[model samples]
Target chain A: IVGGYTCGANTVPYQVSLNSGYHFCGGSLINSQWVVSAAHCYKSGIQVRLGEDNINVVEGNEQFISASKSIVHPSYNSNTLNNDIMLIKLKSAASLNSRVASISLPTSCASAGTQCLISGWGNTKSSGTSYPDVLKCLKAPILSDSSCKSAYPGQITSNMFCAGYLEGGKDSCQGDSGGPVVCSGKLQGIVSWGSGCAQKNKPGVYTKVCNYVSWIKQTIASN
Target chain B: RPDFCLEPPYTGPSKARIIRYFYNAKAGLCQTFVYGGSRAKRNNFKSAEDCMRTCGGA
Candidate 1:
């Protein structure tokens, strides 16, 4: 998950740059001062770059902000990889541009079979490597809680949601973690983990952002 | 990363005596197992504190 657009429209995906290199993942520009991404990205040293199609050629005075601090949820467990969400507090504010926009979080995302768009630079084909310069998007239907629970027994908790094709060949992979799973112009979830890149019987798991809205708002407000 | 392993040492045959020293998380008689049989390896201690001080720098 790597880009945002105005309400009710799709925007060109942008690339997130870390100290190591550029990554194809989506993010929501919540405010001019802050953007929300996955905690694992921060734990591995990530920096966000907005407003560009070709990440290497984005010449609009790219704004670089080293994450000053990261706040992972208190109950976050590495073993189960639960509550795997984090906020990236920029050292300074980013100037809003055509490529930079904030997205809204859905208040009620539990609606059954909610269809949403998932974008990333993840592997287009299973067992493949990450895309370098291109961005990709897919239409995935959000699975109902009961169905999702049934599919991934003992792993799907209230804090998590599921998406992607159950038959395989369409899902988020390594670089897609912490990206957005957008639906109805609102954030439904954040990419968490999956059994593999895009394997059969393995749906993409996400951190249910709707359930954490208050925690997010409160943490951002106080920090 | 430096490799580390857990090893529990005992001084008595009775479970009570062994459990008294290596029973809980806060205190134990566990020692770090070293590989390659280096001479720097120290003998097992009876307490966590003793092990920590003996192999503190390792």
Candidate 2:
């Protein structure tokens, strides 16, 4: 997000870079051979770059893996961006080394009081063009479903959730889609969309990860 | 623009109190402060006319 700072090197091993024609989105190394990201991030020549801390410089510990297959949720809505989740079957399993790892899937839905972390290479500020060279991380507190409903009244469905600052200084905006929202060291949400960049009282929206545990398991197993 | 103005121990309808005027750093405007004081009846607002009428041009 725009208000975050440079993350420590290799702090988020599950974080993966999703590069298509541009350095666009991010992904999570969910398992040995599966990567989870936003379904809308699908594009030709899409691939996963693991063990990445800085985007401008490729370090020795990095691993560039190809996406053999991209599985977007059948019910995903491009217009509304609901159910914005996807899984990428890697051509091969990534070696679970120190620089690369996977994250734990959430067994239950996240509550409003849940505190989560979001990291990515999105813009550094709402009105700026600076794409941070290194991964940026910031705290994103989950808003109560009722409060989230208040902001986007009659719009937020069960498939979606909200997380961001109330004061409008921080948020996940353009160029940071498909990034992981980790809560309690477990996958919680995926950066999906927002009304605008750091809009007042309107927090950035995300795809609730816990809602599709069975779907994720089935997709990974079938493939 | 202040139809009402008062200090504590006051409870009345204040259209815009003189004390309810301050510089809004975020909006970059000299707007009326409806946050606290008598203007607590309202929320945040913006009006250079309301501000100047209450506070100064600064």
Candidate 3:
């Protein structure tokens, strides 16, 4: 998340750090054994650390688990970024406690202009190299697809949506991919991509989770 | 149900699939199921005819 500050511990219990060694992306625990993230965050040797306020050190409430399988969406295009969603099945179910719980998936689409919170371990700056050991958060207002399309033009698709600001103080940047954009009590979006990490008029784009609710349910139930 | 979704009691490979997304008019959304691919998402489902064979009924 851009324009972020260190968040309080356990502020986002559902948030998890995806480590392929370095904290390359973020993920959300949607259930005891399932995590939802961006398909672009897919990799071969990824593991996840859950229920941790800090990534550098282990916490009493934390659980480190290996990803048994990674399911990228059937139609996820690396070129267009459509269907930019994935589900990681943990080798074992996470113990749900106060520090590790599931986040709700939205039942319907969030309207433009809605306010939301984004949290992750991604760099807050565009050219910054150092990532925060602790999770960071920022508030962003959802942007209209028309407005987003105006800025993005022929690039936006049905599977994608936009959020953040034109003035560009707060947004999700590099290493924030696969994190949650929580609005209300549910997860409304996933941190998919941006033009250049909080650039002017170009907001952070996300996979429209509401559109994939059926897909998620079906995938979870079948697998 | 047809185990149309991977609810549980399912211990199998979960990678690569040709999902049949049946768009619901009322919900204005797409409900999906795996029509092909058990190990990879890309390079699966060679054609529309191929994808339609298993995920055929509405």
Give the candidate number with the greatest lDDT.
Answer: 3
Clashing pairs in 3: A220-B6, A221-B5, A221-B6, A221-B7, A222-B5, A222-B6, A222-B7, A223-B6, B16-B40, B16-B41
Per-residue C-alpha lDDT of model 2 across residues B1-58, encoded as one tens digit per residue? 5322232222121111112344443454454432211213322223556555553422
Lowest summed lDDT window (length 10), candidate 2 chain B: B9-18
Clashes of each: 5, 0, 10
What TM-score does chain B get in every candidate?
0.29, 0.26, 0.27
Give the TM-score comparing model 3 with the true structure, all chains together.
0.78
Every candidate's lDDT: 0.58, 0.74, 0.75
Error of 1 at A127 (Å): 1.9
Docking class of 3: incorrect
Q: Put the candidates in TM-score order, highest first.
A: 3, 2, 1
- lDDT of model 1 at residue A118? 72
Sorted by lDDT, highest first, which candidate order results? 3, 2, 1
Where is the poorest 10-residue window by lDDT in model 3 chain A?
A122-131
Question: Mind giving the per-residue lDDT tens digits that candidate 1 earns over A1-223?
Answer: 2121212212643333333244524455677766666655444355666654444565664566666667778877655667878777776877776666677877886576778877654445555343435445667878777777877788788888888777877776555566677888888877777665567877778888898889889998888
- What DockQ, on C-alphas, does every prediction get? 0.02, 0.01, 0.02
Candidate 3 wrongly placed segments (more than 4 Å):
B1-58
